Every structure is written in structure tokens, then in C-alpha cells.
Amino acid sequence: ESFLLSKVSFVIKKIRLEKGMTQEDLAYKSNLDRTYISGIERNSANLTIKSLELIMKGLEVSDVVFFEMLIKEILKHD
Amino acid sequence: ESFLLSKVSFVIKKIRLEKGMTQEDLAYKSNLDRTYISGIERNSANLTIKSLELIMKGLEVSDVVFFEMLIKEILKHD
Ligand code: NA
Ligand code: NA
């Protein structure tokens, strides 16, 4: 897993926890099942753009805020 | 179910999410299985004191902090 794949997983999980959400709440709100959410948060290699859009909606985060949090994580830690 | 039983379950879940843990992470660290953790989060009626001590250990919360969070929930919301 490259730094980018680990940090896409990292930012999904970080926002989910910031929001007080379980994996099962995010599964329900993203229309992707709980094993799929757990899998993505471990390795985001095969997460598709369509599924990332569903997860941003289920986190109630805009795409701009999600990608800004990702860029900050890359800049300050890669 | 009474406010007490609901609030034991609420406080367990609240600390679990504050610790960034899934139900499987907590099951593993408490030595109680995932279905047992999920059942007591729904309804703590049959949670024993010994299982509660295993859970507080798996959350790495002291019994004093656990019970102080429960009293603050009861006072503020009941
Ligand atoms: Na996908
Ligand atoms: Na559950």
C-alpha cells in the first residue's frame, strides 16, 4: 500500500470517527456494506470513484473538504 | 428498557468510539465475542459485572472514569 492508498483509508476513518460514526452507520449511510467499509479502511486500492462519492455522502463531507484533508495529510506527512 | 440499562450501553459505545475502536476491536481486547459486544450495546440487561470489568479493560478505561461518565449521563439526562 503506497502512502496515497493508506492515507485515503486514513482520512475516511478519521472523518468517520470525528463524526462519531461506527462502520455500520457509515455502511448504512453510504449504501456499501459493513465488510466493504472495513475492507476499504484497511486497503483502499480497489475503492472506485463512485464508491468514494457514496462514502463522502455517507460522511456528510463535501468532496472539496475530503480532498483538502487528503492533500494536507500528504503534504505534512509524506 | 430503563434509562440505566440504556445508558450503560450508551457509555460503552461512546467510549469505544472515543477510543477509535470497532466492535471487533473491542471483542478482541475484552475477551468477549463480537455478537456479545453488539448485543450488550443494544441491551445491557444481561451484562454481568465480570463482563463489564472485561469491557472496561478492553476499552482501557478505569472503572472510576466509567462510572463517573455513567453518573454524568444519568444526572444530565434522566
Ligand atoms: Na468500489
Ligand atoms: Na451493533
Author numbering:
A (entry chain B), B (entry chain A): 2 to 79
What do the paper's sentences say?
The most widespread of these mechanisms employs a “controller” (C) protein encoded by a gene downstream of its own promoter, and usually co-transcribed with the endonuclease (R) gene as a single transcriptional unit. The C-protein binds at various sites within the C/R promoter to regulate transcription of its own gene and the associated endonuclease gene. Unusually, in the RM system Esp1396I, the C-protein also represses the MTase (M) gene by binding to the promoter at the transcriptional start site, denoted OM where the C/R genes and the M gene are transcribed convergently from different promoters. Flexibility in this loop is very important for DNA sequence recognition, as it has been observed in the nucleoprotein structures to adopt different conformations depending on which operator site the protein is bound to.
The mutant proteins Y37F, Y37A, T36A, S52A and R46A were crystallized (the latter in two different space groups) and the crystals diffracted X-rays to a resolution of 1.5–2.0 Å. The KD for the R46A mutant was ∼30 fold greater than that of the wild type, showing a much weaker interaction with the OM operator site, and consistent with a key DNA-binding role for this arginine side chain. Both R46 and T36 of C.Esp1396I are seen in crystal structures of DNA-protein complexes to interact directly with the base pairs involved in sequence recognition, specifically with the G and C bases, respectively, of the C-box recognition sequence GTC. Five of the monomers in the asymmetric unit are observed to be in loop conformation I but the sixth more closely resembles that of conformation II, which is almost identical to that in the DNA-protein complex with the 19OM operator site. Both of the R46A crystal structures and the S52A crystal structure have adopted loop conformation III, despite the varying buffer conditions and crystallographic interactions in those three structures. The SO4 based interaction observed in the high-resolution wild type structure is also observed in the Y37A, S52A and monoclinic R46A structures. Both the monoclinic R46A and S52A structures show almost identical crystal contacts to those of the triclinic wild type protein, even though the space group and unit cell are different.
